Amino acid sequence: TAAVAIRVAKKKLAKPPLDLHYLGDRVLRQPAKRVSRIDDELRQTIRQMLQTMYSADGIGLAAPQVGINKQLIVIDLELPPLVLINPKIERTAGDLEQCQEGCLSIPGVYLDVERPEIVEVSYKDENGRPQRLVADGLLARCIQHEMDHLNGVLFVDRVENRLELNEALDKKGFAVQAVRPV
Numbered sequence: 001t002a003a004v005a006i007r008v009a010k011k012k013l014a015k016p017p018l019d020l021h022y023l024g025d026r027v028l029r030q031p032a033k034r035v036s037r038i039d040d041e042l043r044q045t046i047r048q049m050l051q052t053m054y055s056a057d058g059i060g061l062a063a064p065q066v067g068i069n070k071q072l073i074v075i076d077l078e079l080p081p082l083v084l085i086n087p088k089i090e091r092t093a094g095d096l097e098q099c100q101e102g103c104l105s106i107p108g109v110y111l112d113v114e115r116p117e118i119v120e121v122s123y124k125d126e127n128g129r130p131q132r133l134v135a136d137g138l139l140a141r142c143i144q145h146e147m148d149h150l151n152g153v154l155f156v157d158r159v160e161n162r163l164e165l166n167e168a169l170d171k172k173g174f175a176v177q178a179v180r181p182v
């Protein structure tokens with residue numbers, strides 16, 4: 001019986017509860033383990049992910065980014081957050097759209113990424129109930145970005161412009177050698 005409620009305030013925190021890892025760190029390149037059990041301990045991790053996300057001003061956060069090797073994502077675009085546990089992309093749709101992306105694991109780097117406009121995903125929610133969602137726009141983009149993290153893929157991997165990739169990584173102190181093919 002769940003006893004942990006997910007009721008997280010959106011606040012800057014002096015000391016975020018979970019620690020980010022950044023491009024080059026091998027934790028970002030490890031395909032995430034399935035979540036075995038959706039219990040109250042997992043809900044507290046969810047709370048801490050949301051607190052960490054909000055404090056860093058993100059709209060999504062995947063557990064590998066904070067060194068937790070689990071198929072777990074939290075998303076909140078709104079000015080009730082979405083929790084995806086063991087998600088699967090069922091298919092994509094629409095046209096391929098190129099938009100600017102950033103990542104909390106690659107601070108300061110903004111580059112164009114082409115993705116399908118629309119995504120359908122199946123997942124278990126924070127109460128263990130199976131759900132399915134179809135998304136478009138920024139939500140579809142964030143979902144695909146986060147699912148990338150669960151598979152060890154980072155947005156820089158999808159960037160086609162070598163000049164802009166190298167310049168942006170250079171200006172922010174990251175190594176192009178940390179980039180991987182898709």
Ligand SMILES: CCCCC[C@H](CC(=O)NO)C(=O)N[C@H](C(=O)N1CCC[C@H]1CO)C(C)C
Pocket residue numbers: 057058059060061062065100101102103104105138141142145146149
């Ligand atoms: C766009 C798809 C990426 C969404 C998720 C990321 C956070 C992250 O790294 N998740 O793994 C985010 O909030 N990124 C922000 C971001 O790039 N955004 C937010 C909406 C538009 C886009 C560029 O401004 C930056 C400001 C941290």
Ligand SMILES: [Br-]
Pocket residue numbers: 024177178179
């Ligand atoms: Br590397």
Ligand SMILES: [Zn+2]
Pocket residue numbers: 102103104105145149
């Ligand atoms: Zn990211």
